[PDB]
Structure 1
């Protein structure tokens, strides 16, 4: 407990492509890079020679493979995957020194799922059974890990960000060198997604003055598998209005705020200080008590390096409207060390020791604050 040197720096990735960890599947072990996803619950790996893939699960080479003789079809809002369910021995080279029999969805057909140019071949769904496909009987990997070993029912993520991103996934523990100050915990409202309740929203300290139910319509989640801070449409509308006002020194086209176009500045001449901080107050552990997390423009203005039609420093506005509730994606998580404390049904936030900042402002986790009617901020029906 407290320090896990061998798990430090076990995450890699590229900007806009997510964070992956090294895993082994089968006997003898087949090495795969696997996307770390707190927004889903399936362990699903490429099992066929899709041209975008560096490598894939070859079930014929594994003596420990077992067929569940069951298919699974997973459509998303944009794209799909389809696979054949089985079990095999799963290990994490730069994680705990254990081997687990886990459910594996062997991906045999997909559309807009794998990324052309990416270095990962599967997805580690770290959320709960309730949202597993096809149903809650298909035990998620981390549930299997805890059930079969003495690994504590907790993991933590330090996503570092801005061409190669890095970070740490501490399995079964917390590493105190990864954060500064104190951890503050928000209750997991329900174990399906990592669902949380946002009780107050500020832009540069200015409250948005909305019914706090709107902040969590229809849910708020912490999701390492999403880049953006995604806000419910009505919240997004009001947040951008306030961000527009706060950043009035320079004017930008309407399309930039909708993520329909990028904005470019000359190298090193990026004006961070004209852009406001964004604060989310989260439900605390105690009745009427809350805490505040605060991110910088460094988090919500993402560098886009892939532009060929431009030679400057171009950025995407990575706060976007949503119809699925608040998604606290990489835009949030890159500022913080995030502790998914499953044993105690809570999520901890602390200032990340690796987060990107200037000399005038840092990301912050602050409390305690007094907030009434926090239970009424959650959505029902």
Structure 2
């Protein structure tokens, strides 16, 4: 649901995906990063070395001040600014205009990125995690309350098939995937929180208490680049990934996500890097499904062929970031408290292996896999 939004995303590797928006009357055009890992809609509203444009409130006939300040601290970066409401629309989007909350960003630190082409962020997760508090209605919530747009969006993030993709607001576009959608419950409405019931690398169960995979949570987050795994899980995965690829040897800064590794163009040894299967809780009792990630997703290319290890240690739970979401079509079915995965039409290539969404699997005591 529908052709107008196909290919409405762009970006640079490791700097997120953005969609074109306009705010104010007359309309001012900004590129906005699409972030299911937070819930604030915020935009450059003042000069910055890295911004090529920004939101000019005084130039907008429709702007209203909320006379209240705001700040948001992300994993690394943070911004603060001023709350208002203005009229907002997505040009390659549904055909509508909403009055939404906007944080006019006045100061920032390590937020905007030099390469960038985006001037703001669209937090698509739920009011619970919004700043300054849950009474600040998120953008998707206002678009739903104010229009007829169904309460569902879908993200097809593609990986260089200078990245691109689609954000279908309001529905599912059957032209963007193959095979069956498989759905996992949204465990609680705050982040897009899910439960991982099993983990296998090259078909070997990690054999951990399934609570460790969700410790203290597992989320789907398009605003975080890497797959981020709890310490105990990170250690076990890097252990098997090391051993699968031991034929060759790598700097330590490589496994820590720091320094790139290189091979002669067209000779990257993909076969020595294992596939990772994440099993998600399903819709029916004792039933789950798996997504399989290929090394082409977790060895993210940096500009010979050169890559960073795109899995990292977490102390805040599992993060399924952009590299996991790439080559899947991921449906955020808020209306039904579920997230659907299918093989995307921009799926990642290997000459001998494929990324897959497969089910059904039987898995006992999936309830026990949730932390607390």
Kept in 2: contact 1:155–1:172 (CA 8 A): yes
Three-state SS of the structure 2 residue aligned to 1:164 is: coil
- 1:79 deviates by 2.8
Kept in 1: contact 2:183–2:282 (CA 8 A): yes
Kept in 2: contact 1:217–1:325 (CA 8 A): yes
Kept in 1: contact 2:158–2:326 (CA 8 A): yes
Deviations 1:140-199 (A, max 9, x none): 000000000000000000000139100000000100110010000000000000000000
> What is the correspondence of 1:95-174 to structure 2 with a 5 Å cutoff?
95-162=93-160, 164-174=162-172
2:47 to 40, 43, 49: 49
- 1:357 deviates by 1.1
Kept in 1: contact 2:161–2:346 (CA 8 A): no
CA distance in 2, matches of 1:76, 1:18: 14
Which has the larger displacement, 347-356 or 248-257? 248-257
Q: Which residue of 2 aligns with 1:329?
A: 321
Kept in 2: contact 1:200–1:280 (CA 8 A): yes
State the TM-score, normalized to the length of structure 2: 0.99
Three-state SS of the structure 2 residue aligned to 1:213 is: helix
Which has the larger displacement, 17-26 or 71-80? 71-80
CA distance in 2, matches of 1:362, 1:100: 41
Kept in 2: contact 1:15–1:163 (CA 8 A): no
Which has the larger displacement, 250-259 or 355-364? 250-259
CA distance in 1, matches of 2:217, 2:152: 23
Deviations 1:226-248 (A, max 9, x none): 11000001000001111111122
Kept in 2: contact 1:162–1:356 (CA 8 A): no
Deviations 1:41-75 (A, max 9, x none): 00000000112101100000111100100001222
Deviations 1:292-330 (A, max 9, x none): 00010110001111xxxxxx2110000111011000001
Deviations 1:250-275 (A, max 9, x none): 22223211112211001111111111
Three-state SS of the structure 1 residue aligned to 2:243 is: helix
Which has the larger displacement, 247-256 or 202-211? 247-256
Three-state SS of the structure 2 residue aligned to 1:302 is: strand
Kept in 2: contact 1:38–1:222 (CA 8 A): yes
Mapped pair 1:362 → 2:354? yes
Kept in 1: contact 2:42–2:103 (CA 8 A): yes
> Moved runs in structure 1, 4+ residues, more than 4 A?
none
Three-state SS of the structure 1 residue aligned to 2:193 is: coil
Which has the larger displacement, 163-172 or 42-51? 163-172
Which has the larger displacement, 97-106 or 67-76? 67-76
CA distance in 2, matches of 1:58, 1:257: 44
- 1:130 deviates by 0.3
State the TM-score, normalized to the length of structure 1: 0.96
Q: What is the number of residues matched between the two proteins?
A: 372
Deviations 1:265-294 (A, max 9, x none): 011111111110000000000110000000
- 1:355 deviates by 2.0
Kept in 1: contact 2:202–2:274 (CA 8 A): yes
Gaps of 5+ in 1: 306-311
CA distance in 2, matches of 1:204, 1:79: 35
CA distance in 1, matches of 2:121, 2:330: 19
CA distance in 1, matches of 2:104, 2:353: 46
